[PDB]
Amino acid sequence: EEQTIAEDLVVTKYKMGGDIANRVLRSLVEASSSGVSVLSLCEKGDAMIMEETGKIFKKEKEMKKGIAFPTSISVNNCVCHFSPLKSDQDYILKEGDLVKIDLGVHVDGFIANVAHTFVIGVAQGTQVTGRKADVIKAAHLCAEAALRLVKPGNQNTQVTEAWNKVAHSFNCTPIEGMLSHQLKQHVIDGEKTIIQNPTDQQKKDHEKAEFEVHEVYAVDVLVSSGEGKAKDAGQRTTIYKRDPSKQYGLKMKTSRAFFSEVERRFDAMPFALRAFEDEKKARMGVVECAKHELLQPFNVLYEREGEFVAQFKFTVLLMPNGPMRITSGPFEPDLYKSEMEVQDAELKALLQS
């Protein structure tokens, strides 16, 4: 069968994961200051997840728990999936940097995803202004709109539409083609999805769905101050996910050993190459696996230099009495001052409940 949030136990597993994800996120935020290595924060994040996860359900020896999405910190125009290797060049945080932290925790396959955006070195008493406030303000209001639109009976389409209206108000554009996935036990890759600002082509190929009672979603809002077109850079993909629906006979011994460690350690959850002791081996075993589509990569995307990308990701449980989000970051609206606001009367109304 399948275990859903219709069962109380399933719900407590999501809530504990969400609680753990909310705490690790807060620790990383307050550990972010100018001069700090992004690589070190990613390691600390992953380590905390692993430790917090080890304090629950101890009597259950075979229960899988841990990282659902490796800690990634994407600064300024970097869109997502930035999770450095000891080898790659990392990023050193600076005053005024717009940083996005993305984490993923799971307990028994039940995933709790969260992403938060904030600015470095913001003196208290003072607000942040400019494009950094416009974009964060917009991403925030997009998250708020989803929270009110993603409910049993509605359809992904309505959410897609609301997002452009909010975003346009601050002259921001949600990154085109980004998807928000439904969640299931051990599946971070849900079938039903919500697409952001789709191109005419994608609009025609994306499947229109309807939210059902007892479903779970990881709503991912990615808004840009620029054109909203994410491009690949010279960056190395350091995050991969095993595709359980595909199989192939790897020829190389190193490929097989690497794939076995993956199936055993992370199963179908995204993981970071940093999780393997020998880097060279990992990198080497990835080539053939990724080549025969056994592994799905999560590339590091970028927006034009000078632009900023804000993000808000939260996991919401569609309970019969209403949606309940189990993850969020320490967000303070008053901190950001923008000259623009939502102008659509109807939308303006919806945002006040």
PDB file of all heavy atoms in Angstrom, residues 186-201:
ATOM      1  N   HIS A 186       9.748   8.346   0.737  1.00  0.00           N
ATOM      2  CA  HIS A 186      10.957   8.067  -0.047  1.00  0.00           C
ATOM      3  C   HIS A 186      11.016   8.732  -1.429  1.00  0.00           C
ATOM      4  O   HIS A 186      11.991   8.557  -2.162  1.00  0.00           O
ATOM      5  CB  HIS A 186      11.143   6.556  -0.210  1.00  0.00           C
ATOM      6  CG  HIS A 186      11.377   5.834   1.082  1.00  0.00           C
ATOM      7  ND1 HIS A 186      12.488   6.060   1.867  1.00  0.00           N
ATOM      8  CD2 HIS A 186      10.626   4.922   1.741  1.00  0.00           C
ATOM      9  CE1 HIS A 186      12.408   5.320   2.958  1.00  0.00           C
ATOM     10  NE2 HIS A 186      11.289   4.619   2.908  1.00  0.00           N
ATOM     11  N   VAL A 187       9.984   9.495  -1.775  1.00  0.00           N
ATOM     12  CA  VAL A 187       9.926  10.183  -3.059  1.00  0.00           C
ATOM     13  C   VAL A 187       9.918  11.691  -2.875  1.00  0.00           C
ATOM     14  O   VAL A 187       8.977  12.252  -2.319  1.00  0.00           O
ATOM     15  CB  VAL A 187       8.658   9.787  -3.851  1.00  0.00           C
ATOM     16  CG1 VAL A 187       8.555  10.607  -5.135  1.00  0.00           C
ATOM     17  CG2 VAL A 187       8.689   8.299  -4.162  1.00  0.00           C
ATOM     18  N   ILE A 188      10.978  12.342  -3.343  1.00  0.00           N
ATOM     19  CA  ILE A 188      11.111  13.787  -3.246  1.00  0.00           C
ATOM     20  C   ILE A 188      10.729  14.315  -4.618  1.00  0.00           C
ATOM     21  O   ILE A 188      10.582  15.513  -4.830  1.00  0.00           O
ATOM     22  CB  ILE A 188      12.582  14.181  -2.901  1.00  0.00           C
ATOM     23  CG1 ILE A 188      12.661  15.661  -2.513  1.00  0.00           C
ATOM     24  CG2 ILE A 188      13.491  13.921  -4.086  1.00  0.00           C
ATOM     25  CD1 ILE A 188      14.018  16.083  -1.979  1.00  0.00           C
ATOM     26  N   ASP A 189      10.536  13.360  -5.523  1.00  0.00           N
ATOM     27  CA  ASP A 189      10.200  13.552  -6.940  1.00  0.00           C
ATOM     28  C   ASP A 189       8.721  13.405  -7.308  1.00  0.00           C
ATOM     29  O   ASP A 189       8.422  12.923  -8.397  1.00  0.00           O
ATOM     30  CB  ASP A 189      10.967  12.508  -7.762  1.00  0.00           C
ATOM     31  CG  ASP A 189      12.076  13.101  -8.569  1.00  0.00           C
ATOM     32  OD1 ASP A 189      12.201  14.342  -8.588  1.00  0.00           O
ATOM     33  OD2 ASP A 189      12.818  12.318  -9.198  1.00  0.00           O
ATOM     34  N   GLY A 190       7.808  13.800  -6.429  1.00  0.00           N
ATOM     35  CA  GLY A 190       6.384  13.660  -6.713  1.00  0.00           C
ATOM     36  C   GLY A 190       5.899  13.880  -8.141  1.00  0.00           C
ATOM     37  O   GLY A 190       6.424  14.730  -8.860  1.00  0.00           O
ATOM     38  N   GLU A 191       4.873  13.120  -8.533  1.00  0.00           N
ATOM     39  CA  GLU A 191       4.273  13.185  -9.872  1.00  0.00           C
ATOM     40  C   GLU A 191       3.587  14.523 -10.146  1.00  0.00           C
ATOM     41  O   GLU A 191       3.829  15.155 -11.176  1.00  0.00           O
ATOM     42  CB  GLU A 191       3.239  12.063 -10.053  1.00  0.00           C
ATOM     43  CG  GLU A 191       3.758  10.652  -9.787  1.00  0.00           C
ATOM     44  CD  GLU A 191       4.131  10.421  -8.321  1.00  0.00           C
ATOM     45  OE1 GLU A 191       3.228  10.474  -7.449  1.00  0.00           O
ATOM     46  OE2 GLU A 191       5.328  10.190  -8.042  1.00  0.00           O
ATOM     47  N   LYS A 192       2.707  14.937  -9.240  1.00  0.00           N
ATOM     48  CA  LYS A 192       2.016  16.209  -9.396  1.00  0.00           C
ATOM     49  C   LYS A 192       3.007  17.338  -9.117  1.00  0.00           C
ATOM     50  O   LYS A 192       3.802  17.263  -8.178  1.00  0.00           O
ATOM     51  CB  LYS A 192       0.847  16.302  -8.429  1.00  0.00           C
ATOM     52  CG  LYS A 192      -0.240  15.275  -8.658  1.00  0.00           C
ATOM     53  CD  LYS A 192      -1.452  15.635  -7.821  1.00  0.00           C
ATOM     54  CE  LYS A 192      -2.573  14.625  -7.966  1.00  0.00           C
ATOM     55  NZ  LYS A 192      -3.716  15.052  -7.126  1.00  0.00           N
ATOM     56  N   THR A 193       2.963  18.386  -9.931  1.00  0.00           N
ATOM     57  CA  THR A 193       3.889  19.498  -9.763  1.00  0.00           C
ATOM     58  C   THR A 193       3.261  20.844 -10.093  1.00  0.00           C
ATOM     59  O   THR A 193       2.223  20.922 -10.760  1.00  0.00           O
ATOM     60  CB  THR A 193       5.114  19.334 -10.680  1.00  0.00           C
ATOM     61  OG1 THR A 193       4.676  19.314 -12.043  1.00  0.00           O
ATOM     62  CG2 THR A 193       5.847  18.036 -10.385  1.00  0.00           C
ATOM     63  N   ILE A 194       3.901  21.908  -9.616  1.00  0.00           N
ATOM     64  CA  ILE A 194       3.450  23.267  -9.887  1.00  0.00           C
ATOM     65  C   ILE A 194       4.635  23.881 -10.618  1.00  0.00           C
ATOM     66  O   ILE A 194       5.767  23.813 -10.137  1.00  0.00           O
ATOM     67  CB  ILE A 194       3.187  24.067  -8.589  1.00  0.00           C
ATOM     68  CG1 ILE A 194       2.231  23.305  -7.676  1.00  0.00           C
ATOM     69  CG2 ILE A 194       2.570  25.406  -8.923  1.00  0.00           C
ATOM     70  CD1 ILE A 194       2.113  23.919  -6.309  1.00  0.00           C
ATOM     71  N   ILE A 195       4.385  24.470 -11.780  1.00  0.00           N
ATOM     72  CA  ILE A 195       5.463  25.060 -12.554  1.00  0.00           C
ATOM     73  C   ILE A 195       5.463  26.575 -12.460  1.00  0.00           C
ATOM     74  O   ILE A 195       4.405  27.211 -12.375  1.00  0.00           O
ATOM     75  CB  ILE A 195       5.357  24.629 -14.034  1.00  0.00           C
ATOM     76  CG1 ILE A 195       6.632  25.008 -14.797  1.00  0.00           C
ATOM     77  CG2 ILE A 195       4.124  25.264 -14.674  1.00  0.00           C
ATOM     78  CD1 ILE A 195       6.798  24.226 -16.086  1.00  0.00           C
ATOM     79  N   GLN A 196       6.659  27.153 -12.465  1.00  0.00           N
ATOM     80  CA  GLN A 196       6.792  28.599 -12.386  1.00  0.00           C
ATOM     81  C   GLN A 196       6.970  29.214 -13.759  1.00  0.00           C
ATOM     82  O   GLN A 196       7.707  28.685 -14.594  1.00  0.00           O
ATOM     83  CB  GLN A 196       8.023  29.020 -11.573  1.00  0.00           C
ATOM     84  CG  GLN A 196       7.989  28.788 -10.084  1.00  0.00           C
ATOM     85  CD  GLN A 196       9.112  29.540  -9.370  1.00  0.00           C
ATOM     86  OE1 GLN A 196      10.200  29.712  -9.919  1.00  0.00           O
ATOM     87  NE2 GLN A 196       8.853  29.986  -8.146  1.00  0.00           N
ATOM     88  N   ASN A 197       6.289  30.330 -13.979  1.00  0.00           N
ATOM     89  CA  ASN A 197       6.434  31.113 -15.200  1.00  0.00           C
ATOM     90  C   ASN A 197       6.912  30.274 -16.385  1.00  0.00           C
ATOM     91  O   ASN A 197       7.995  30.489 -16.923  1.00  0.00           O
ATOM     92  CB  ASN A 197       7.424  32.243 -14.862  1.00  0.00           C
ATOM     93  CG  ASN A 197       7.798  33.095 -16.048  1.00  0.00           C
ATOM     94  OD1 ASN A 197       6.950  33.463 -16.863  1.00  0.00           O
ATOM     95  ND2 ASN A 197       9.075  33.440 -16.138  1.00  0.00           N
ATOM     96  N   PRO A 198       6.091  29.315 -16.817  1.00  0.00           N
ATOM     97  CA  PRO A 198       6.435  28.437 -17.936  1.00  0.00           C
ATOM     98  C   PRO A 198       6.492  29.122 -19.299  1.00  0.00           C
ATOM     99  O   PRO A 198       5.765  30.074 -19.560  1.00  0.00           O
ATOM    100  CB  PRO A 198       5.345  27.369 -17.871  1.00  0.00           C
ATOM    101  CG  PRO A 198       4.153  28.157 -17.437  1.00  0.00           C
ATOM    102  CD  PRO A 198       4.707  29.079 -16.365  1.00  0.00           C
ATOM    103  N   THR A 199       7.378  28.630 -20.160  1.00  0.00           N
ATOM    104  CA  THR A 199       7.511  29.157 -21.514  1.00  0.00           C
ATOM    105  C   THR A 199       6.322  28.583 -22.269  1.00  0.00           C
ATOM    106  O   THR A 199       5.745  27.577 -21.844  1.00  0.00           O
ATOM    107  CB  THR A 199       8.795  28.660 -22.201  1.00  0.00           C
ATOM    108  OG1 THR A 199       8.783  27.230 -22.248  1.00  0.00           O
ATOM    109  CG2 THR A 199      10.028  29.136 -21.454  1.00  0.00           C
ATOM    110  N   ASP A 200       5.953  29.207 -23.383  1.00  0.00           N
ATOM    111  CA  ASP A 200       4.825  28.721 -24.170  1.00  0.00           C
ATOM    112  C   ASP A 200       4.924  27.220 -24.426  1.00  0.00           C
ATOM    113  O   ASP A 200       3.912  26.521 -24.438  1.00  0.00           O
ATOM    114  CB  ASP A 200       4.736  29.478 -25.495  1.00  0.00           C
ATOM    115  CG  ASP A 200       4.342  30.936 -25.306  1.00  0.00           C
ATOM    116  OD1 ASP A 200       3.275  31.195 -24.696  1.00  0.00           O
ATOM    117  OD2 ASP A 200       5.096  31.824 -25.769  1.00  0.00           O
ATOM    118  N   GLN A 201       6.139  26.718 -24.621  1.00  0.00           N
ATOM    119  CA  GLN A 201       6.308  25.293 -24.855  1.00  0.00           C
ATOM    120  C   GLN A 201       5.960  24.496 -23.598  1.00  0.00           C
ATOM    121  O   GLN A 201       5.142  23.576 -23.640  1.00  0.00           O
ATOM    122  CB  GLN A 201       7.742  24.976 -25.278  1.00  0.00           C
ATOM    123  CG  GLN A 201       7.998  23.479 -25.485  1.00  0.00           C
ATOM    124  CD  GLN A 201       7.055  22.850 -26.515  1.00  0.00           C
ATOM    125  OE1 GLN A 201       7.095  23.189 -27.703  1.00  0.00           O
ATOM    126  NE2 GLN A 201       6.199  21.935 -26.058  1.00  0.00           N
TER     127      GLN A 201
END
